[PDB]
Ligand binder design. Structure first.
Ligand SMILES: NC(=O)c1ccc[n+]([C@@H]2O[C@H](COP(=O)([O-])OP(=O)([O-])OC[C@H]3O[C@@H](n4cnc5c(N)[nH+]cnc54)[C@H](O)[C@@H]3O)[C@@H](O)[C@H]2O)c1
Ligand SMILES: NC(=O)c1ccc[n+]([C@@H]2O[C@H](COP(=O)([O-])OP(=O)([O-])OC[C@H]3O[C@@H](n4cnc5c(N)[nH+]cnc54)[C@H](O)[C@@H]3O)[C@@H](O)[C@H]2O)c1
Ligand SMILES: [Zn+2]
Ligand SMILES: [Zn+2]
Ligand SMILES: [Zn+2]
Ligand SMILES: [Zn+2]
Lengths: 374, 374
C-alpha cells in the first residue's frame, strides 16, 4: 500500500559538519522512472561516512549519508527491469550503468555516472527524493543508506540471493569488497609474495584476507594502534608493526624486513604521508603500491618521481576495482558458499537509533565494523 | 698488441659541470677479472648525457660520460665467458648480474648492481680504469662510451651479431630500446588504443614506434617545438599538438581530444609538470601513464592522489623495462631482421672529435640523435 506514495520514516540527517547525526522524520518520495525504493535492513558504519562528518570527504550538506548496506525493495519506478519488489538488494555507491566507456572497458569500474569525483548529492536526474522539516536533503554517493527507506537509481542497485543474511552481507557493499578486491583484482597479489598493509581497520583487514587468499607468504600489518594487531593476525597477517615503536621511518623498517622492499603494499588509511611511505616500501624495480584510503579533500602529496622511474607501479581504486552490479551478487553467492568470512569484521551491533554511539566506537578506535539494524 | 697493457687513447673528459667536453689523451688500464676492454666504434648523444653536463643528473666528476654505444672487444680479463676479443658489443648502462632479486624477478630489470640510484662513478670493484693528466677520472653508469676505449664489467656488456652495423645499433644501447620498451613492455599498449607521447626527441619517437607496433589507433605527439612534428608523424603519430598554441592546459585539451582521456600516456621529457599532466590526461578509471624522462635532481612533484584513487596506473622504468643482457642481442637480431627502423632517429653523423658540436645540435633543438664515429 505504499507504492506511489510518499513514505514518512526515520533517517539520520547530517545538518552540519563535525556534529552528531540527527535521527528524525524525513519524507521519501516514490521512485521515478528507473528508480528503486528500498526498505533498509542493515547498514555498516564505514570510515568514509565519518569523513563526511569531518569534512575529509566533501559532499553537499545537509545530507543522508551511509553507503554500505542491504535491504529489501519496497517499490520500483517505471521501466525498472533488474529488481522487483521483495528482492534483497545491496545499494551500489559506485554505479554500473553498463553503457559508458568505463563500464565497457574490461578493467574499469569507476563508472562515469558516479557521484564521487565531483559530488552533487542528488539522484541521476539532479534532484532529491528526501525532505526534512520541509527542506530538501542531499543524497550521498547515490545511496543514502542511513534511512529506513532510500531511493536509488537502478544503475546503483544489485539484486542478491534471496536467502542472504543482510546483517552480514551489507559489508559486501563497501568495506569487504574494497579491501579484498584491492588485493586480488587491483594489485593482483601473487603466490609466495610479501605484502605490507597500512591500516588495520575493516578495509585493511579485508585487504589482508585478499592477500592470504591470493597465497602471499608474508603479510605485514602496520598500524599505530596495537589493539588492531590481534585481529589482523587472525585473518592472515604474519607479523604486525607499529611505526611509533621505531626510531627510523617505517618505509626503511619495511625495506629491511623484506630484504629490499615488499612485492605489494596498500595504503588503507587516508593520509598523504602514508601514501608516499607505502609506495617507498615496495621494491624499487618491480613493486606495486595501491592507494585505497581516501585523502583529505583537495590536498596534494609531494613525492620524488625517481620512486617510479626505477620501476615501481602506483595505482589506486574505488571499490576494489569491482564492476559493482556484476560483482556484488557473485560476492554474495561466494559468501553463501563460505568462500570468505565476514564475521571477523563485525565487532559491534547496534540498532539504527544508536548510530551516534556507533560513530563514537569507530572514532575511539574500539570497533572495526558496527552493523546497524533498522 | 695492446692486451695486458695500459692504452693511451683519446676521450672526451668532463672536468666540471656546464663546460664543454675536453677532448684529450687518457690512460685506460687493462681489464681485471670479469672485466672487458672495448674499442669504441660509435656512440650516440643522449639527453641524459647532457643532464650530466647541466647538473640535472648528478654523478661524480670529473667523468667520462656516454652510455649509448657500440664497439669491438679488445681484450677480456680473467674469468670472462660471455664475450671474446673481436666480438661486437653494446655496453649496458643498466647491468644484468643475473643473481640479484631483481634479475631473478620475471618483470624486474633495474639490477641492484646499477650505478644510477646512488652513483659512485666506478667499476663494480669501486675503482677506476681511467686517468687523465695524472688524475683518476670517474666512469658513468658502468659504461663511459665517450672514449676510444673503455673498460666495463662483464655484467655491463652484451655480445651482438657480428654482422651488425654499429653506427646504427648503438641506439639499442639506450634511446631506441628505452622508448620502444616503455610502450611495448612497460605500458603494454593495446591494439586500437589512444596514446599520448610528451616529448618528441629520440626517446619519444621510439615510444611512438612502439605504440604503432602495438597497434594503437591514435598516437598524439606533444612537443613545444613544432619542428619535431614531421618526423613524429613519419614514425606513427596521427596528430601533433603544441601546448603553446592553446589557451587551456594541455591535459584538458588531450582529455577532450580523446573523448574523456587517453588509454596510455608517456612523459618523455624530464619535467615535473609534464609528469603530472601526462598522468592527468590518461583516463581516470583505466588509464596508464609511464614516466620515462629523467627529472632534475632531488626535486619533488606535487599531485592530488585522487588521480590514482579513481583507477589510474602510474609507473616508470629504466631502459624500457628490458633485462639488458638478455634483450640487447635480441633487439639487434630483430633490427637485422627488419622488425623496426633506426634511421628515422639519426639526424646527424659526426666524427667523435666534434662531440661538442653534437651537443650544441641537441641543445638547440636541431637534432634527434647525433651518432659520433671514432
Ligand atoms: N577506495 C575505496 O573505495 C574505499 C572504500 C572504503 C573505505 N575507503 C577508505 O579506506 C580507509 C580505511 O577505511 P576503514 O578501514 O573503514 O577505516 P578505519 O577503521 O579508520 O581504519 C584505519 C586504520 O588506520 C590506522 N591508522 C591511522 N593513522 C595511521 C598511521 N599513521 N599509520 C598506520 N596506521 C594508521 C588506524 O589506527 C585504523 O586502525 C578510509 O580512508 C576510507 O575512507 C576507501
Ligand atoms: N628512463 C630511461 O631509461 C631513459 C633513457 C633515455 C632517456 N631518458 C630521458 O628521456 C628524456 C628524453 O630524452 P631524449 O628524447 O633523448 O631528449 P630530447 O631529444 O631532448 O627530447 C625531449 C623533447 O621534449 C620537448 N620538450 C621540452 N619541454 C617540453 C614541454 N614542456 N612540453 C612538451 N615537450 C617539451 C623538447 O622540445 C624535445 O623535443 C630525457 O629526460 C632523458 O634523460 C630516460
Ligand atoms: Zn558506466
Ligand atoms: Zn566505504
Ligand atoms: Zn642483478
Ligand atoms: Zn640514455
Amino acid at each position: 500500500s505504499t507504492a506511489g506514495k510518499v513514505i514518512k520514516c526515520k533517517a539520520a540527517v547530517l545538518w552540519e559538519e563535525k556534529k552528531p547525526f540527527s535521527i528524525e522524520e524525513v519524507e521519501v518520495a516514490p521512485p521515478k522512472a528507473h528508480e528503486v525504493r528500498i526498505k533498509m535492513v542493515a547498514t555498516g558504519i564505514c570510515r568514509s561516512d565519518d569523513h563526511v562528518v569531518s569534512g575529509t570527504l566533501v559532499t553537499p550538506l545537509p545530507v543522508i549519508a551511509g553507503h554500505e548496506a542491504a535491504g529489501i525493495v519496497e517499490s520500483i519506478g517505471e521501466g525498472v527491469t533488474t529488481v522487483r519488489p521483495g528482492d534483497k538488494v545491496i545499494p551500489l555507491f559506485t554505479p554500473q550503468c553498463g553503457k559508458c566507456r568505463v563500464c565497457k572497458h574490461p578493467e574499469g569500474n569507476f563508472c562515469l555516472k558516479n557521484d564521487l569525483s565531483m559530488p552533487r548529492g542528488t539522484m541521476q536526474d539532479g534532484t532529491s527524493r528526501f525532505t526534512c522539516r520541509g527542506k530538501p536533503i542531499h543524497h550521498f554517493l547515490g545511496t543514502s543508506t542511513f534511512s529506513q527507506y532510500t531511493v536509488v537509481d537502478e544503475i546503483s542497485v544489485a539484486k542478491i540471493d534471496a536467502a542472504s543474511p543482510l546483517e552480514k552481507v551489507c559489508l559486501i557493499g563497501c568495506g569487504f569488497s574494497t579491501g579484498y578486491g584491492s588485493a586480488v583484482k587491483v594489485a593482483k597479489v601473487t603466490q609466495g609474495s610479501t605484502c605490507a598493509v597500512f591500516g588495520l581497520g575493516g578495509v585493511g583487514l579485508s585487504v589482508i584476507m585478499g592477500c592470504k587468499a591470493a597465497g602471499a607468504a608474508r603479510i605485514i600489518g602496520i598500524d599505530i594502534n596495537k589493539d588492531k594487531f590481534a585481529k589482523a593476525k587472525e585473518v592472515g597477517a604474519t607479523e604486525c608493526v607499529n611505526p611509533q615503536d621505531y626510531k627510523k621511518p617505517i618505509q626503511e623498517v619495511l625495506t629491511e624486513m623484506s630484504n629490499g622492499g615488499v612485492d605489494f603494499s596498500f595504503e588503507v588509511i587516508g593520509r598523504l604521508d602514508t601514501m608516499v611511505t607505502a609506495l617507498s616500501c615496495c621494491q624499487e624495480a618491480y613493486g606495486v603500491s595501491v592507494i585505497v584510503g581516501v585523502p583529505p579533500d583537495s590536498q596534494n602529496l609531494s613525492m620524488n618521481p625517481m620512486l617510479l622511474l626505477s620501476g615501481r607501479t602506483w595505482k589506486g581504486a574505488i571499490f576494489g576495482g569491482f564492476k559493482s552490479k556484476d560483482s556484488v551478487p557473485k560476492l554474495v553467492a561466494d559468501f553463501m558458499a563460505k568462500k570468505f568470512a565476514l564475521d571477523p569484521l563485525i565487532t559491534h551491533v547496534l540498532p539504527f537509533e544508536k548510530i551516534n554511539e556507533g560513530f563514537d566506537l569507530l572514532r575511539s578506535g574500539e570497533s572495526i565494523r558496527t552493523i546497524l539494524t533498522f
